[PDB]
Amino acid sequence: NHIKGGFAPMFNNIQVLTPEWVYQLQQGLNSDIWSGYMATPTGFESGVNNTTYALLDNWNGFIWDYGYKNVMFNAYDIANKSKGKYDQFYALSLILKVEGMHRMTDTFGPIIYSKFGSNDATIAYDSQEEVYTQMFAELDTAVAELTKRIDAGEASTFESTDMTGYKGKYESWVRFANTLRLRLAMRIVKVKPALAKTEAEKAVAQKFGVMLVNDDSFKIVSPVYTNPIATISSSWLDIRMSADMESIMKGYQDPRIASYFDTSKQFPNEYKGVRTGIAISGKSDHQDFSGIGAVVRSKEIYLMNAAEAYFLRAEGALRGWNMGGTAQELYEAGIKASFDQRGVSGAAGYIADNTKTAAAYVDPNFPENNSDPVNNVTVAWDAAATNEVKLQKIITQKWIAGFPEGQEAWSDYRRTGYPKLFPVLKNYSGGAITTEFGVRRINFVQSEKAGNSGGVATGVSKLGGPDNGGTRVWWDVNAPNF
Amino acid sequence: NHIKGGFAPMFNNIQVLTPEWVYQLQQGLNSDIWSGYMATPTGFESGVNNTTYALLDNWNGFIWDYGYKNVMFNAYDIANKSKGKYDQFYALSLILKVEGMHRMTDTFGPIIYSKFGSNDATIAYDSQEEVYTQMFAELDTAVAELTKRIDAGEASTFESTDMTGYKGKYESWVRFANTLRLRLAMRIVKVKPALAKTEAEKAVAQKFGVMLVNDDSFKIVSPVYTNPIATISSSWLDIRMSADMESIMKGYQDPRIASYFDTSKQFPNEYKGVRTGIAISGKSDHQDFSGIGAVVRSKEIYLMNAAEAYFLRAEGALRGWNMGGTAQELYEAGIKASFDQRGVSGAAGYIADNTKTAAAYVDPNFPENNSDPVNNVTVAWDAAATNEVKLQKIITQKWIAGFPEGQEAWSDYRRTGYPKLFPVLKNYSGGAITTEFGVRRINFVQSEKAGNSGGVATGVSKLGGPDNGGTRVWWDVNAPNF
């Protein structure tokens, strides 16, 4: 009973479910926009903000503070109480820890990890390379422990505490952990392709393997909280469909558009997105473009869909790895999984179409925001296509399937450059962040500079360059995809 | 006859031998100082300059302009005249091309390579990753061609054109090419350890192997010019012994100090170095510190010593690669090779010393420039030391042996962080360049922004971040040494 209470704040703060204004700062005004998923019609701080590459420390500190207070602390506390005593809870805490904390390192680079809880005046940061090794080892520990208990036929003691689709089922938690390993493996393929291959193949070959059906998906099922985006969109009109989403989903005439977005008030019965990184004269100019749709009007918040497992395996197969299918088979299975998850028909026709491509983008009353399409690729698999075009197809479909979870899409975009996104028109970074490559990370936070200046200095050392949004984290090496 | 004339400008402009003021800008006021080899007593441009991390476009453009006009153009011209007709000359041009142009990409990152000589308005840059692949392939072509001729007993037709220690001997040119391959292979060990291993092992496996004795060293033997550093130092007093060299070489009581540097005029019979990245009141405050010594009072300019081949193999052995010998054997052999090269005795005692370490640095009349030692490692091999300490020993000895060739030392320092160097006290980069990590590259040059703006845009794209001195080139990944 003293252990079980630590899980709720972990579940409730991977994405901060309440209050909504905290989610808006934790993710809504960073990766949800940089990923190309969503855009704001509001000219916050005179239009000089995260969306125009002037990173705002007053906004971005919330990411660190809520994650450490609610995810990391409880991982630490649960481990202290359970490791070597109630190892099933320790194992489950490790899986949740990695789910929450990989997002943290993917945002900042170096982070506090091994030294968390230290009483030293300096709480040192680990390098991102070190954190990734630790996370893979933590998943090793968790998977071995739970698999042992499953093999023994041990009844779960986690159902009453679980807040996911899994209802305490250890096998489902292991399958999630395997899929999370596969995500982390693919993340590092440019910097450590040998480790990427090892960890990816381990994930797929583990007894219970990775996600195969939609019931395998990782989601938070809250008894009381709606996805915060519902309020930020429908109530506040502070976030809308993006121009990238309009270009790509209208181009493909994608039936998932109906659940992802609402038709526009300003343009009745039409799906209209807002361009990011623009000049904004008044909020009313874009607030009546398309809102975020029914997928966020729910107490269930998806954090990793089964579709992603297929697209990860498809990329692994493209790279020649032992993924259990061909790149084409896995690509097409991923698309079908997503169509099924969204409850829409026509997957077969969509999959076979080798004509439809991204559409031109028009901002009707502000043509300065217009663009020719940039993600110029069809859905249909072409065996004769280059590896880059094959990867572009896979990541495009992965990006569509993963909406509205902007953090993973931002990480995948940084790594692969896909899908192609419209560049910002206004860049107020003073040269620190490029228009072509956009935001590569967020700089170390105010609470840390205030209370842990010695730690921040270790973080800067392990970052290897200026502490701004243009400096690449360890896995985001300036290197080609193959 | 029409082909041979192209070689002289290549030989004479890897380091620009004349005029001396051009060498000062090409290398003397960048890597010769950033490497920790040398320091200026002169407060050029009010002390806001390359040495205080305000990169000066009017200085640094010389690197690109002289390299492309004299090395690259002649490689291109010779290839056009000789490829498929006189392949011995083509092969030799490729080796010289890689010797000159690897320095170029190591300085800027993306460079013009495959598209050189294009008539298009945009002459596109290649990525550094692409350039490295091409250089390895060029060395493959050169090595195969010359080895074929050697195997056939074909007499050299290059002696009258050669301006090195090799006197036209193809076998010595192949041995140099192998050693250059090994250098380039180790450079990329953090970004592409698989390719690093492949290319390093190829270098050693080739039938002539890498440099073994000092006569194998690559040097320019000028019939007319003295090393331009002799003038810059002795005549102009614009460059002096550095504080890092004083700390390290005095700490070890290294007998090579006597030929590397002259005793100070201000401090009779003492070796005194100047701190880099400082405030300078007047040139006279430091101009009478130690000058650069007898090693530059020569018409022979060393560009790759046999000692480096041993230290490359030593590091390869640390990594478990097929290098011939143990890390300890190769380390000690490299030190002996360097002592022999410089004509000094006492190698055995120096090699066995496990006490002497870097000395504290004092600027007698300006104590604000003082520092405790930072390269705190002894010479003696310790089998029980960590891989990092072993590497620190190897690179420290490599750094001493390679004086006064600052470019390779700067590249090795960027890759490994060794030897430890004194940080600058003044940093006028406006945040673009960190004090901790120093200059990682030079920004694209004025002549290119003026006459090839389309090409520069491709270079910036292939750089992956802001075009300034803090952005890391492809091989300079933020990753650990092992």
Numbering used by the authors:
A (entry chain B), B (entry chain A): 45 to 526
List sentences quoted exactly from the publication behind this structure.
CusDI and CusDII exhibit comparatively low sequence identity (27%) and may thus have different carbohydrate affinity characteristics. Isothermal calorimetry (ITC) studies with the recombinantly produced proteins revealed that CusDI binds the full range of tested oligomers (chitobiose to chitohexaose) with similar affinities, and even GlcNAc, though with much lower affinity. In this assay, CusDI displayed some enhanced affinity for chitotriose. Despite considerable efforts, crystals with bound ChiO ligands were not obtained, likely due to crystal packing, which for both proteins affected the predicted ligand-binding site. The overall structures of CusDI and CusDII overlay with an RMSD of 2.2 Å for 363 Cα pairs and display the canonical SusD protein fold featuring four tetratricopeptide repeats that act as a structural scaffold. The most striking feature of the putative substrate-binding regions of both CusDI and CusDII is the presence of two Trp residues that would provide a flat platform for binding ChiOs as well as insoluble chitin, as has been observed in chitin-binding carbohydrate-binding modules (CBMs). CusDI features W280 and W65, whereas CusDII displays W330 and W74 that are located at non-equivalent positions but may nevertheless have similar roles. While both glycan-binding platforms overlay within the known glycan-binding site of SGBP-A, they are offset from each other, suggesting that ChiOs are bound differently by each protein. The area of CusDI surrounding W280 and W65 displays several residues that may provide hydrogen-bonding or electrostatic interactions with individual GlcNAc residues of chitin, while there are fewer such residues within the aromatic interface of CusDII.
The studied chitin utilization locus (ChiUL) is encoded by the soil saprophyte Flavobacterium johnsoniae, which is a Bacteroidetes member exhibiting gliding motility. The SusC/D-like pairs are believed to be specific for their cognate carbohydrate targets, and act in concert to bind (SusD) and transport (SusC) oligosaccharides across the outer membrane. The resulting ChiOs, and likely chitin crystals as well (analogous to the archetypal starch-binding SusD protein of B. thetaiotaomicron), are captured by the CusD proteins.
